[PDB]
């Protein structure tokens, strides 16, 4: 996240770090004690079996016994299209169930078909790059965003931090967009580069896949 702010410790206990060989490559969301939700491109070219799911984290540079760690048992996708970046959502089943507590809680999802409109105020978050060679974030970042419709396609929920150069960046794919306390987006792609200030960020529209997700986690 570029131009955001350090989240309050454990402010978003549904936030997940997906790590490989000791490296955070994507974010995810705890949607059920044994299911996390991410972007399909985050797992399409990796060996899932080495991917570790980390819950209850806040500062990835520090040791945190608060954290819970799980491996990936199975994945479930619905037609991810890499050429057009459509349906960029995946559900990962874990090798266990999370113990819900002060650091870890299951997120809350919107209803099938719900579409947010222009001007809706939402929040993005993640551990992606901080921008301008600052490198990847150690402590989870959050950013106020506004839903836009220009330079967007209906297959996505698009966001813009109007008035300044900020937005999601690399390492944030798969992180949630939330909005009204409801997880409406999963970071999918940028255009031109991060924090362009002229191109919206594109999120997978979670409210378009609600039926399948419940078909998986019930």
């Amino acid at each position: 996240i570029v131009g955001g702010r350090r989240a309050r410790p454990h402010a978003w206990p549904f936030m997940v770090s997906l790590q490989l060989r000791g490296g955070h490559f994507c974010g995810a969301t705890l949607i059920a004690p044994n299911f996390v939700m991410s972007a399909a491109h985050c797992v399409a070219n990796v060996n899932v079996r080495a991917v570790r799911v980390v819950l209850g984290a806040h500062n990835l540079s520090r040791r945190e016994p608060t954290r819970q760690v799980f491996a990936v048992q199975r994945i479930f996708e619905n037609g991810y299209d890499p050429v057009n970046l459509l349906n960029d959502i995946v559900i990962l089943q874990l090798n266990g169930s999370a113990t819900i507590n002060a650091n870890v809680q299951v997120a809350q999802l919107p209803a099938q078909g719900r579409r947010l409109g222009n001007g809706v105020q939402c929040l993005a978050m993640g551990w992606g790059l901080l921008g301008r060679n600052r490198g990847i974030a150690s402590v989870l970042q959050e950013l106020n965003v506004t839903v836009v419709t220009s330079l967007c396609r209906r297959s996505n929920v698009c966001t813009l931090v109007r008035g300044r150069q900020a937005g999601v960046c690399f390492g944030d794919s798969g992180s949630p967009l939330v909005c009204n306390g409801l997880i409406h987006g999963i970071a999918s792609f940028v255009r031109g580069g991060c924090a362009s200030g002229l191109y919206p960020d594109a999120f997978a529209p979670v409210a378009q896949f609600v039926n399948w997700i419940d078909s998986i986690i019930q």
């Binding site: 490989l20 060989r21 490296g23 955070h24 490559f25 994507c26 972007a39 491109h41 985050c42 399409a44 070219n45 990796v46 060996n47 890499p82 050429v83 970046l85 960029d88 992606g128 790059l129 990847i136 999601v168 960046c169 690399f170 390492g171 944030d172 794919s173 798969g174 970071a187 999918s188 792609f189 940028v190 255009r191 031109g192 580069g193 991060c194 960020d201 594109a202």
Partner: protein, 103 residues
């Protein structure tokens, strides 16, 4: 001042490929974005075969294909400015094959 991974690559433009055997340096044990790698590919296209951004724009097709250590592949359209918002390991790329056709 730090170790580098040597990734084989090939470049073909208009059906011509030079017969050297070449390798791209990536910082070892590092993480990279598709913006980073795409920029390195564009730099290689220019410095090795004089292919400009303008040529990539006017070309019939301009792509590079990553072959990953797991054996999967990812075709990247150099004419597109959309980038997935993920990071990946430099150690996981087995080969890169660049192909530009002006046609």
């Amino acid at each position: 001042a730090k170790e580098m991974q040597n990734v084989p690559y090939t470049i073909a433009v208009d059906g011509i490929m030079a017969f050297n055997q070449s390798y791209l340096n990536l910082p070892k044990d590092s993480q990279l974005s598709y913006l980073d790698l795409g920029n390195k590919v564009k730099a290689l296209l220019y410095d090795e075969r004089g292919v400009t951004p303008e040529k990539i724009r006017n070309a019939k097709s301009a792509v590079y294909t990553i072959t990953w250590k797991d054996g999967s592949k990812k075709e990247v359209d150099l004419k597109k400015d959309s980038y997935t918002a993920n990071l990946f390991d430099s150690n996981s790329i087995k080969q890169i094959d660049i192909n530009v056709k002006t046609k």
